[PDB]
Design a protein around this nucleic acid. Structure first.
Ligand SMILES: [Mg+2]
Ligand SMILES: [Zn+2]
Ligand SMILES: [Zn+2]
Ligand SMILES: [Zn+2]
Lengths: 92, 65, 49, 138, 56, 56, 101, 49, 119, 99, 8
DNA sequence: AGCTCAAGTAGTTACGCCGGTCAT
RNA sequence: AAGACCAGGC
DNA sequence: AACTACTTGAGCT
């Protein structure tokens, strides 16, 4: 239905991707003193929006809580130790 | 992988409380936190015990011989 | 709990905290030869060798 | 899809950013030495100058690029046709092999058929172009 | 990033994380940050044995 | 502190403009080349020294 | 620097430009080779003056003109008098050269 | 080549969205150079938006 | 420069001198064709370029979404929808002035203020 | 990417510089089998090959011209020729294969 | 350093 | 026939300590 | 029993 | 993967 597209790295070059679907859209006619300071959406050229930024992660980081709050080089470590913890690898 | 008798942290028994809990949900339709509270699970040490158990035994049981 | 070493509460280690099963599987075969000479699976003792 | 050869095309550009002899030569599969692009064109099916510059440059008003090509034209000024073109690539015995390395080795993708000489030529042109497009900081 | 207007020489584009860890990085910030650390991890995994040669 | 987290925010905003400012003043050729450096390089050299002192 | 002159700002420069290797290539905006067969006038406008004002206090009809940069002559600091002076003595008696002011 | 492409472009792109030229193919228009990239290739990593 | 070829056998043009009459000729070394000089200019080097900053700007340059939007107003049509960039001359020593195109004309106005251009 | 080799690719490969001074046509790709002496050809399953150290591969036939057997191809679990591709929740629990 | 500044 | 000068081409050596799987 | 390869540890 | 050693090649009297 043309509501979503498969963008390879090459085609990517010539598109404009919006992060948050919401915020990066409606006009403007204060803010919370806690959240992270966000820049803007000063543009209307957008061609595509991000399903969700937390999708740029792969299996590893996906289990890491608030990976957006640690020193990146650490996340990279846990990214490895996970493949070394205990649990259940199958039920059979 | 079955319910854990007694809480690691403090020690209070908790084997029986499994069915009571998994029940106060399905039927009496009460949210987690509350179920526990009436089941008598006060401080988080034992709280986390129940509220975090993932009963695998069920799936294991689905196997044949 | 100094220098990345941590203290773990024995008491709850007993109540089964962080205990884990460990499996292993040694395996073998009974090799042969196109020249009918086969191996064996028995409970050997003495016997000339 | 089909065998899958692993031979690459080299469209060099001698003469450092100074010396007077800034020529353009390219490497072909199985050929010992290298050939100066002009010949590669006449050996292809384009024999006159400016018809060669036809393929490389797409804007008669771009003297810089064209200039660059000049010295190159002079390189091949000694071979004036398709006969000799396919020759200098080392009689009758040698000329025949020349063809081969162009219909089955030269920019083998596109197609290794026959009557498409033209097409590969526009590429080798689009290539010699891409080369300069940089050697002129663009 | 493709999430940016061409020729943006500003800091929010060139990799300046204005946020604090207590607050949390935005995708962009979070990414650059990774590319930065990634360089770090690199030599800690290269200078590790070449340093040992020079030592030897 | 409640207000310190603010006092900082605006030390990045102002620092942001002391950048937007020298970017305007560069996108006009209204700056001279510090001997030995490229007009561009000299642009960075300031942006960098601006964000750093801000962050500091 | 040498013993004396220490905090001599201009003395610094005065040595810089006596060491920092500067070549004709770094001050030339462009070079062209025109066809001018008359060694007493040009086929070029913005050159006329530069001929007449250079005959008071054999050659080839082939010309070679160089257009040096202004801002580039203030940086490495240079002079037409010098620049050419050098050029001239480089080739010498087998290359007549001229220049504006 | 192609004469006015602006449309050649927003036609292929409408062709993919109905699903008549596999959602897997890549089409890039580089106006800033005047070229049209076509990719069917096997091994191009892609994400959805 | 903008040099020339030749009718007959479309080739490169080499120059020769009109000794006895003092003037410039151009020619061919494949046939015989010969034409007088178009201009006294023969060769140029140009070390400090400035041509190629306007880099191919098809009208469609208002359809490349990856480009920025400025709300100024061209020096002619007085619009308010312009796109821009920096020289395409990839030279580590270039400068950073903005060239603007208007969705209502296709002009080439800058932001500069020490020089002036029309190209 | 696997199905793409079986389904299509695999064909184009057998059919190119084939024909010999004897040609080849469509090729057949059956499901898992176990050709052992002292038994017919047991229709094989993952969880077994696993335990018995075997090979989860099936047969390859080609309509050769003057039908014919040519090699055993190792299938990819959870693919298409792998029975798992269909079986549902309950279906699997019976093959001892963890869902 | 890398993740703090240039110089750092 | 012969000689200096530059370039090519040849070749070499590199890294701390500590379970699985395959096959001659 | 010796080797090779992959994996992983500070 | 980068250098540095060693010997060779081509330009030049
Ligand atoms: Mg350690
Ligand atoms: Zn408890
Ligand atoms: Zn002619
Ligand atoms: Zn206008």
């Amino acid at each position: 239905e043309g509501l979503v597209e498969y963008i390879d790295a090459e085609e990517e070059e010539s598109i404009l991707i919006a992060m948050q679907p919401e915020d990066l859209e409606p006009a403007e006619a204060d803010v919370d003193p806690a959240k992270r300071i966000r820049v803007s959406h000063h543009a209307t050229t957008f061609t595509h929006c991000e399903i969700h930024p937390s999708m740029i992660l792969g299996v590893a980081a996906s289990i890491i809580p608030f990976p957006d709050h640690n020193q990146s080089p650490r996340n990279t470590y846990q990214s490895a130790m996970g493949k070394q913890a205990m649990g259940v690898f199958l039920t059979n | 992988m079955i319910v854990p008798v007694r809480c690691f942290s403090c020690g209070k028994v908790v084997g029986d409380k499994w069915e009571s809990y998994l029940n106060l949900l399905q039927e009496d339709e009460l949210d987690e936190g509350t179920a526990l509270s009436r089941l008598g699970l006060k401080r988080y040490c034992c709280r986390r015990m129940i509220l975090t158990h993932v009963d695998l035994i069920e799936k294991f049981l689905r196997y044949n011989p | 709990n100094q220098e990345d070493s941590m203290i773990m509460n024995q008491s709850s280690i007993d109540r089964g905290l962080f205990r884990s099963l460990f499996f292993r599987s040694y395996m073998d075969q009974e090799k042969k030869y196109g020249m009918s000479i086969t191996e064996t699976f028995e409970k050997p003792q003495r016997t000339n060798t | 899809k089909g065998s899958r050869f692993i031979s690459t095309l080299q469209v060099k550009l001698y003469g450092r950013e100074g010396s007077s002899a800034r020529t353009i030569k390219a490497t072909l599969p199985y050929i010992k030495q290298d050939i100066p692009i002009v010949i590669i064109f006449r050996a292809l099916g384009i024999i006159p100058d400016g018809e060669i510059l036809e393929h490389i440059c797409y804007d008669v008003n771009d003297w810089q690029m064209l200039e660059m090509l000049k010295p190159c034209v002079e390189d091949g000024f000694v071979i004036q046709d398709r006969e000799t073109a396919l020759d200098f690539i080392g009689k009758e015995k040698r000329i025949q092999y020349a063809k081969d390395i162009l219909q089955k080795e030269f920019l083998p993708h596109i197609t290794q058929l026959e009557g498409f000489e033209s097409r590969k030529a526009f590429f080798l042109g689009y290539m010699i172009n891409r080369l300069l497009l940089c050697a002129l900081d663009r | 990033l493709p999430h940016f207007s061409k020729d943006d020489y500003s800091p929010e584009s060139k990799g300046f994380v204005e946020n604090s860890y207590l607050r949390g990085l935005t995708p962009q910030e979070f990414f650059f940050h990774a590319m930065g650390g990634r360089e770090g991890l690199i030599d800690t995994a290269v200078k590790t044995a070449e340093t040992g040669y020079i030592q030897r | 502190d409640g207000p310190t987290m603010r006092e900082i925010t605006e030390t990045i905003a102002e620092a942001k403009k002391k950048v937007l400012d020298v970017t305007k003043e560069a996108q006009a050729n209204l700056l001279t080349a510090k001997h030995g450096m490229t007009l561009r390089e000299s642009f960075e050299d300031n942006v960098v020294r601006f964000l750093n002192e801000a962050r500091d | 620097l040498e013993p004396g002159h220490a905090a001599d700002q201009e003395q610094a420069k005065l040595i810089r430009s006596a060491i920092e290797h500067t070549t004709l290539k770094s001050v030339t905006i462009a070079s062209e080779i025109y066809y001018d067969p008359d060694p007493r006038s040009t086929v070029i406008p913005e050159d006329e003056e530069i001929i007449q004002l250079h005959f008071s206090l054999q050659q080839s009809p082939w010309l070679l003109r160089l257009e040096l940069d202004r801002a580039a002559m203030n940086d490495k600091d240079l002079t037409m008098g010098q620049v050419g002076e050098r050029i001239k003595q480089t080739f010498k008696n087998d290359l007549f050269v001229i220049w504006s002011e | 080549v192609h004469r006015n492409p602006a449309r050649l472009m927003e036609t292929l792109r409408t062709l993919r969205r109905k699903g008549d030229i596999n959602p897997e193919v890549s089409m890039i228009r580089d106006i800033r150079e005047k070229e049209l990239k076509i990719f069917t290739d096997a091994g191009r990593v892609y994400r959805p938006l | 420069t903008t040099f020339r070829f030749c009718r007959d056998c479309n080739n490169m043009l080499y120059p020769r001198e009109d000794k006895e009459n003092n003037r410039l000729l151009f020619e061919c070394r494949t046939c015989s064709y010969v034409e007088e000089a178009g201009s006294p200019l023969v060769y140029r080097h140009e070390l400090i370029t400035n041509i190629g900053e306007t880099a191919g700007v098809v009208q469609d340059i208002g359809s490349d979404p990856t480009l920025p939007r400025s709300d100024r107003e061209c020096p002619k049509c007085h619009s308010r929808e312009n796109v821009f960039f920096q020289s395409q001359q990839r030279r580590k020593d270039t400068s950073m002035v903005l060239f603007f195109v208007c969705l209502s004309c296709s002009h080439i106005f800058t932001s500069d203020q020490k020089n002036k251009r029309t190209q | 990417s696997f199905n793409q080799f079986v389904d299509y690719t695999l064909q184009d490969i057998i059919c190119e510089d084939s024909t010999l001074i004897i040609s080849f046509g469509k090729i057949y790709v059956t499901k898992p089998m176990v050709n052992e002496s002292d038994g017919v050809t047991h229709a094989l399953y993952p969880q077994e090959a696993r335990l018995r150290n075997l090979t989860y591969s099936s047969g390859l036939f080609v309509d050769v011209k003057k039908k014919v057997f040519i090699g055993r191809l190792p299938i990819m679990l959870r693919s298409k020729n792998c029975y798992l591709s269909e079986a549902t929740e309950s279906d699997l629990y019976k093959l001892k294969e963890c869902p | 350093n890398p993740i703090w500044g240039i110089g750092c």
